Design a protein around this nucleic acid. Structure first.
Lengths: 195, 195, 195, 195, 195, 195
DNA sequence: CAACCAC
DNA sequence: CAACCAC
DNA sequence: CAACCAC
DNA sequence: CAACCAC
DNA sequence: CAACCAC
DNA sequence: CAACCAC
DNA sequence: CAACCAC
DNA sequence: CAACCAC
DNA sequence: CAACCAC
């Protein structure tokens, strides 16, 4: 039961260790960016299956910001988009929402067929002068059998793939002040035998 | 399994993206206000079936209000009236309650046959000078097999209704200060074949 | 047996009566174009199923061209793109081939996933000073259950298409002279019930 | 068992409330006149099935006429005509009869294949100086599963349909003086899925 | 096995030996014409069943025409109209087509219900100065159980026809020159027992 | 059903888009040539299975050649040699034949064991001053499970081949003039698991 | 069978 | 269980 | 699962 | 489900 | 069906 | 399948 | 099979 | 039952 | 059903 259908070989990892600075406008990153090559943690051919994503790390408030009394959450929309073209679209223009508000957000009407939300998961942080909740921990494993397809070329970029691009979209709920998110996004995949 | 009884065609959506300023008196809006027309997100006949309501968004406090130390829950009441007539009745004259208190709110004895509460749900928010819970995220998917009927005229209003009509009543529990609720109310409906 | 799966209603028709002047470079047209409306020969919803395409007409030479001793054939590639964006792509840039020769034509290696060749069918014409053959008849019915989607907006254009979309690509085999093609491309479809 | 075969959707009504002034020569009206459009009580496509006709109202004598001692009946021939062309033919020239007499009337020999009588129903009124029967009531429901076909255009006119036109033919039995008939003819129909 | 349903008697024949000079505009003839009478090759009743049509003969060029380097084909559309009225309609006004091109010909959208194409069968001829092909043979048997009706009167004319009626429509593909067609159109029928 | 026995992975493609100028002597090319590498369209191991060959393109005359009254045909012998050594052998020395006539061609008696003719398929062209036929289309798909081996080294050459190896041999039937052949020879293979 | 229309 | 690693 | 959209 | 009311 | 790519 | 030779 | 006519 | 509306 | 005509 370990390896999925249409794909074979050892379960290959790929990590995206990064400190993401989050805003109200919303940040994006492509989680299914795999370079091609003979090396370990590379894809072999143009086709592979991402079995599971493991998001883990911490969301936290800056030292000058944490004094100010407020609350903010981040949403973590893991969305698959079929038909990925050019640059990855911004959070604001993919998601329909009232007054640029991430809590009210759903996929736009025109491109609802294109993009689908696989997971969303709120993580909340509260500021305070005398008593803050500076940080909150993220530990979300998620099994999502997602088959992707690349071009003839290889550079682990959003442009280079042409099917089921997996995108992580983040957005801070509070409008004024930002928050940081130190995250390891770890994607687990297998190389496809099909085609 | 997808389409309800006596219904046809694609699952049409209708959205009510809005910032509602809530009070102790209570605010109302009809969630079934949909126009008749050939286009998408329009009804075709006078009858149609609402399958599910997806309320999602945020409830939040203003900057001058959040300093003042208090708590308030917003009560969301989803009611169906079997009989609409004229404009929609205010929260005070539908629900009976001690001293206009929405936590004690149930339907009046006279019009208990008329109005029925399908779902109710709360959302707490706490203000504070040095440490606050400024906001709370409302997310609520509610499935209800509700058949609604309209007049011959087609303008998407509570006046044009007949038989059932889905009303959302929102009320702040605290007396003096108000709160905002930035909400997307999304109704999912199908066009009817019956009569 | 008549209507396909997930679609309903009367078999609606659409036609493209037009004289297409062909070159070696390659002409294109989108056969799945159909505007939205309450009237006949219009899609109701954004989704619809094309069940069958009926190409019929004539491919013919001009009076000054036919006198010259040569032969030319037209290929007629009916292709479906699962990802339409903006303007319909040119023949030369979709099909890779030696020296832009349409008889040596297959889909490019990059976008082999996007474009699929549903049908090809040649039609041949021979021009000579005395021993001539001015014209040739085309009569090709071809059945394909093909579910195309549109944007929210209503206009018969390849821009507005989404998910599946049909494209007829025509290209003359001989380099240094053209041929005309008077063709009724007819298309038979049904309105979708799904989503 | 409600909706007939080959047709679907809500049962749509169409009414013809009118005061028909009847003569010996005979009056006609097309009962299956349905305009096409998105609106309520419109047809959707060119094809629909009339399930049932409900004729109701009153036949009555004028104030100066009712003094004169006589009797007259009206026949109410509900006839389907296949092959409707141009204007609707007059009662006198469709029906063969002795000396322009409606009581002796049957369909003409040439166009017996074209026209068929679905219903006839006599309604009788008697005049008198000192004691009249001024009026008589009509209440005739009639179930007649009749599939009709329209042109590409739409205006709810006899010319605009090309199959199974339903015509009501009235004719006063007494030669000299006329009678009035205030009638609601109400036709019940469903939109066709076939073709 | 021989005689069709609802008809009886000896298989009566009828023939139309005639040189039909063809154009680009389109020539027509009614093959179901047969006068009423006690003699042979006459219908007895107003109804009769045409069981089969046997078209045979030659399609040929003139001596001055054949010298010119060109090609032309004739279409031979055998159609049944279920509603005959007056004179037989012209080819151009029944079949819609781009620039009156008979190879791009199908029945008009308005009267698609009235006219049905039972058979089409092309016949091709190539004219040249030396490398010529003056003529081409036509030999097409085609079986169709077809119940036609007449008026009360007795004359082999399309005027007098009613219910089904057969029409052969002929049209030359090339525009600027004619072709001759010496054709025996033969038709085999039986007298109806029904009605 | 898709992948052959003893081989695995995605169906890798290889192409040979080239204008082959043909003579009476006989041109050759090795269609099984494929270099070793981690990239796409490369064999991984020394062994691999060619499942199918798709020849498509055009065979055509030059402008000065076509005017002369003659005919020529090309044979297209697809042969497998089970013993490749060095450079690919010439057409004349493999096939024995009277006066180097390629239509009278079969494998020599000495090396009948080595070479086997898998497919032959003619393509004919006729040149004339006025009554010409400049070109002819080739479209030949042909499926053969064919396990080829290589040397230790990595280069797409017949030298490096071992065990089975494919060779396309082309030869013009007419002696005193050439013909061009613009051909995409495409080949579909899978990497071997055995040994 | 022809090409959404009919026996 | 934790997260391609192992009992 | 998240929310009429796809796998 | 929310609470004697309806679907 | 066309030609490793898809319903 | 091509044409006594092979998978 | 040819084309209402026959073995 | 009355007439596309509902028990 | 209304009356040789059609569904």
């Amino acid at each position: 039961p370990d390896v999925p259908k249409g794909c074979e070989g050892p379960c290959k990892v790929q990590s995206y260790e990064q400190r993401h600075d989050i805003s109200h406008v919303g940040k994006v990153l492509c989680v299914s960016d795999v370079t091609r090559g003979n090396g370990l943690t590379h894809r072999v051919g143009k086709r592979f299956c991402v079995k599971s994503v493991y998001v883990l790390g911490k969301i936290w408030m800056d030292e000058n910001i944490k004094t100010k009394n407020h609350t903010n959450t981040v949403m973590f929309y893991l969305v698959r988009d079929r038909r990925p073209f050019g640059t990855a679209m911004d959070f604001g223009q993919v998601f329909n929402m009232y007054d640029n508000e991430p809590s009210t957000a759903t996929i736009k009407n025109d491109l609802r067929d294109r993009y689908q939300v696989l997971r969303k998961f709120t993580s909340t942080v509260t500021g305070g002068q005398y008593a803050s909740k500076e940080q909150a921990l993220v530990k979300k494993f998620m099994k999502i059998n997602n088959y992707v397809v690349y071009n003839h070329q290889e550079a682990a970029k959003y442009d280079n793939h042409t099917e089921n691009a997996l995108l992580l979209y983040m957005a801070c709920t509070h409008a004024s002040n930002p928050v940081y998110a130190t995250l390891k996004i770890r994607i687990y995949f297998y190389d496809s035998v099909q085609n």
